[PDB]
Design a binder for these strands. Structure first.
Lengths: 232, 507
DNA sequence: AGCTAATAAACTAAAAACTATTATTATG
DNA sequence: TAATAATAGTTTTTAGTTTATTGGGC
């Protein structure tokens, strides 16, 4: 299981991204077997082979209810993996390919479930919020930013916190190099601002966050950053 | 690593290789092929990952790609296999030679330059990193290509060319009744780093006796165990390599394979919900230990951090005279430490200074050793072993610090002891004489595990599918009859000296 | 005249070393 | 516009688990 598996997996993945709901309905058994082979207790596949996570990202079918049933197993596995990974105390923060692949998995999976009605919502909130420094053109930060941008909605009622820190980290991320990271951070900016505005507009304490978050930074703005400021 | 090894064997496909002075002596082709079989067996057990090939010259036919006449390649550069052994042995013998001479020609003119072209091209074929372009050939005569002066000139030109290309070759002396004629045509043209040509060698006197001897080992290459570091106080750190000049070998693990297909079947193993019949996950895992009634649950990094004490490295404790170590205090096989400038530059100078100084002081180095991540660090002693040479100035002992381990208090296991009992001095003298009877000088390479030898014997025997398997000889069995005849009556003399005349030591 | 316990050996996974390559940035 | 730099891909030990294991018993 090597470059053969890598190229085959990316081939079939882009196949689903192209072939969307015509005859690709013989995959439920395939999804089950992929989930089972994930449960191989021997994690001998390489981190590059862990883009099998993007495998579990599945939309080419109607997403039958059995996929929903297995989705909770999937989410628990991802949470355990991530809490194992980010613990830099064990000197094993190494999830280079893992993080982005599980990111895309959660991206294409959260479209069906995980509304802001439970603790795992704020759990995965904290999981993403940890986004210690990185290198290597910073693929994982971009992955996390894209995930948050696509699913900022599910983080309601618990995204209002860390707002200054979230804002400044997004600013630096969109200010860093690797312009792809720039635009991912920009998308995260628009999603975050939209969600916080929507939740504030129907709040009761709205004045607190109002006077404590926004006009000061907005005034301090006065580059493409100006467009973000105007949108804000 | 820094390269690999490969040899190619060249056999004169002529009639001089198919005769014998007397029938007790095999043909030159005969002992050459059997020594080839022995060499291949040794390579398989020792260094099967090497490259070996067989080419013939002087035969009537030919098989080389360039299709030079008389140049018939038999086998190409490949890891040795039992199939090749069978192909060789089908012609190995007093009648298999006739079978070869039937199905294959032998005896014709050719040019050594041509076989050198062929072997050079075969060298070009291989692509892995390569270190020893050793070429082996077998004959008892040299002058046939000196008969044609042009052939001699072109052969020596190509020989010089291949020497320039780094190719090294070696020839075996074969029994030519008129003498191999050393110094006439080859040692002036062949590649030699030294000269011992004094006798034209009417016989085959050279190193077949070593080659036909079968070796049984693995001879793992020089691989650094770790470039682990010595933390002097907190910042004074040096880079040193770790090595084990002795490493307990063991029988290679078996490979589980099928019956009628013999295919090594992959075995996926996982865990599923026993109470449900579903499936479990590595995340869905929790280890437990119940002491009495209470059950305690621990996780992966939970079990990891309890093993965490410090960074993998060496932490100096201090110095203590070598004599303050009890010889009977042993923990496990010792290690060796070698300096390096790969990471800490100048660390070799510090290592040399420390070695010289502590050798002068006759002291040991006490240090805290952490092999790798999440392991309790243990105290060890670094005895300075000076490099000793021999009459050949070869390292009978390399320089550096032999790494001996210091056991802990728990290691000490007390036993029900008894009082001190003495013996009469005349019985001690009898013991001295009896020891002197059977005394000898020990040598490390004089003993070996017969069990692994018998394992090999069986392995190549079933590989060679003979009637019977080769029988290994145990070198660890005492020469009971020889020792008994060497001692004499001193045994029973001391028996009656100490043991009761009526009571034998048997209960 | 019925009863069984350390155990080296074997079997695993797991961690490192040691090669072998390459997603990246100046930069025109 | 295009070179270099962390990276995994093989062995290789190595450090826990597993087992069939002679002795007493009475």
């Amino acid at each position: 299981c090597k470059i053969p598996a890598l190229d085959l997996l990316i081939k079939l993945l882009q196949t689903f991204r192209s072939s969307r709901l015509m005859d690709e309905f013989k995959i439920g058994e395939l999804f089950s077997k992929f989930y089972g082979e994930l449960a191989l207790k021997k994690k001998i596949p390489d981190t590059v082979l862990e883009k099998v996570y993007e495998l579990l990202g599945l939309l080419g079918e109607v997403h039958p209810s059995e996929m929903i049933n297995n989705a909770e197993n999937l989410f628990r596995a991802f949470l355990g993996e991530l809490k194992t990974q980010m613990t830099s105390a064990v000197r094993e923060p190494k999830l280079p390919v893992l993080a982005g692949c599980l990111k895309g998995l959660s991206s294409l999976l959260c479209n069906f479930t995980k509304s802001m009605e439970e603790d795992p919502q704020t759990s995965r909130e904290i999981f993403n919020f940890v986004l210690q420094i990185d290198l290597k053109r910073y693929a994982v930060p971009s992955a996390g930013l894209r995930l948050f941008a696509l699913h900022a909605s599910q983080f309601s009622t618990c995204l209002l916190d860390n707002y200054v820190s979230l804002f400044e980290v997004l600013l630096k991320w969109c200010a860093h190099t690797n312009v792809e990271l720039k635009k991912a951070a920009l998308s995260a900016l628009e999603s975050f601002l939209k969600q916080v505005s929507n939740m504030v507009a129907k709040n009761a304490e709205m004045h607190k966050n109002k006077l404590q978050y926004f006009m000061e930074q907005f005034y301090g703005i006065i580059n493409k950053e100006l467009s973000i400021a105007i949108r804000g | 690593y820094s390269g690999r090894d490969s040899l190619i064997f060249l056999v004169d496909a002529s009639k001089a290789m198919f005769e014998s002075q007397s029938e007790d002596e095999l043909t030159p082709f005969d002992m050459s092929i059997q020594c080839i079989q022995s060499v291949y067996i040794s390579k398989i057990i020792s260094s099967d990952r090497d490259l070996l090939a067989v080419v013939f010259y002087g035969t009537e036919k030919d098989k080389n790609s360039v299709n030079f006449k008389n140049i018939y390649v038999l086998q190409e550069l490949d890891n040795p296999g039992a199939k090749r052994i069978l192909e060789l042995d089908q012609f190995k013998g007093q009648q298999g030679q006739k079978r070869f001479q039937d199905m294959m020609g032998h005896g014709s003119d050719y040019s050594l330059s041509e076989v050198l072209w062929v072997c050079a091209n075969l060298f070009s074929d291989v692509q892995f990193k390569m270190s020893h372009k050793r070429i082996m050939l077998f004959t008892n005569e040299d002058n046939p290509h000196g008969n044609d002066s042009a052939k001699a000139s072109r052969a020596r030109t190509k020989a010089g060319d291949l020497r320039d290309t780094g190719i090294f070759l070696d020839l075996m002396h074969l029994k030519k009744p008129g003498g191999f004629d050393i110094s006439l045509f080859y040692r002036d043209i062949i590649s030699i780093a030294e000269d011992e040509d004094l006798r034209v060698h009417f016989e085959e006197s050279s190193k077949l006796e070593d080659l036909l001897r079968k070796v049984r080992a693995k001879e793992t290459r020089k691989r650094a165990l770790s470039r682990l570091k010595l933390k002097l106080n907190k910042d004074i750190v040096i880079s040193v390599g770790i090595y084990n000049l002795v490493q307990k070998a063991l029988k290679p693990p078996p490979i589980k394979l099928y019956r009628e297909t013999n295919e090594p079947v992959k075995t996926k193993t996982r865990t599923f919900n026993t109470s449900t019949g579903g499936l479990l996950l590595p995340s869905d895992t929790k280890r437990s230990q119940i002491y009495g009634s209470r059950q305690i649950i621990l996780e992966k990094e939970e079990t990891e951090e309890l093993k965490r004490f410090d960074d993998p490295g060496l932490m100096l404790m201090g110095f203590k005279p070598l004599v303050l170590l009890k010889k009977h205090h042993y923990l496990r096989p010792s290690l060796f430490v070698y300096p390096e400038e790969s990471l800490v530059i100048g660390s070799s100078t510090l290592f040399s200074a420390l070695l010289i100084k502590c050798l002068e002081k006759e002291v040991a180095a006490l240090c805290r050793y952490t092999p790798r991540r999440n392991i309790p660090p243990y105290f060890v002693a670094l005895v300075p072993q000076e490099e000793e040479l021999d009459d050949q100035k070869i390292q009978v002992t390399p320089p550096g610090f032999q790494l001996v381990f210091l056991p802990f208090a728990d290691d000490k296991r007390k036993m029900p002891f008894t009082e001190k009992i003495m013996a009469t001095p005349e019985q001690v003298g009898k013991m001295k004489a009896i020891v002197e009877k059977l005394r000898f000088t020990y040598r490390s390479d004089s003993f070996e595990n017969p069990v692994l030898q018998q394992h090999f014997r069986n392995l190549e025997a079933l590989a060679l599918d003979l009637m019977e398997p080769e029988q290994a000889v145990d070198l660890t069995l005492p020469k009971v009859e020889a020792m008994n005849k060497r001692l004499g009556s001193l045994v029973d003399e001391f028996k009656e000296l100490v043991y009761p005349p009526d009571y034998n030591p048997e209960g």
